[PDB]
Amino acid sequence: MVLSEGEWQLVLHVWAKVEADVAGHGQDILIRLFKSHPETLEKFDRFKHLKTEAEMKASEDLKKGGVTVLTALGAILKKKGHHEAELKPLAQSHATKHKIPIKYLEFISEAIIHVLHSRHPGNFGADAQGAMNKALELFRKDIAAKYKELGYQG
Ligand code: HEM
């Protein structure tokens, strides 16, 4: 698929807001993913044991991990689709080492959209949410095809 330049503009304009506080956005986003789909917390051997939102809010590794996720996602969105090299290493550890089904990437994509909608209502209107949904579906589609090449899922 392919995003038009104006859709990439809408995506990178919200993202530029998220970047003003990458760690608080990553915390929000992972906590929302783990509240909504608790099974996903199990994939994290270093947090797995956190029992409440309060413990999550208080954990520095969880905050470190959100920052890692968002920074890697922001570097892929800024390529505007030419992200082949950035996805290769990524698709290799998630398929072979961590073992994150595509289903799990769809869930987090949901949690990202939820959080941006809450924090950025003025910059996250329907059109911008459509463009971000599109950019994220494009991410998942290219990752799923890499997974297939590596021997996972597909
Ligand atoms: C937008 C989606 C994602 C991006 C771009 C992303 C990115 C990354 C990156 C850059 C790392 C560190 C380097 C490496 O291990 O590859 C990481 C590690 C990891 N990711 Fe992902 N990831 C995402 C989604 C997921 C999801 C949805 C889950 C699972 C329920 C997941 C679970 C993990 C785990 C378990 C690690 C290891 C944590 C640790 O022990 O340090 N990832 N992720």
From Swiss-Prot:
Molecular function terms from GO: heme binding; metal ion binding; nitrite reductase activity; oxygen binding; oxygen carrier activity; peroxidase activity
Sites where the protein binds heme b: H94
Localisation: Cytoplasm, Sarcoplasm
Similarity-based family: Belongs to the globin family.
Primary subcellular site in the record, as a coarse category: cytoplasm
GO terms for cellular component: extracellular exosome; sarcoplasm
Keywords attached to this entry: Cytoplasm, Heme, Iron, Metal-binding, Muscle protein, Oxidoreductase, Oxygen transport, Phosphoprotein, Transport
All copies of domain Globin, residue ranges: 2-148
The name this protein goes by in its record: Myoglobin
PROSITE patterns on file: GLOBIN
InterPro entries per UniProt: Globin (IPR000971), Globin-like_sf (IPR009050), Myoglobin (IPR002335)
Purpose of the protein: Monomeric heme protein which primary function is to store oxygen and facilitate its diffusion within muscle tissues. Reversibly binds oxygen through a pentacoordinated heme iron and enables its timely and efficient release as needed during periods of heightened demand. Depending on the oxidative conditions of tissues and cells, and in addition to its ability to bind oxygen, it also has a nitrite reductase activity whereby it regulates the production of bioactive nitric oxide.
Modified residues annotated as Phosphothreonine in this record: T68
Protein's gene: MB
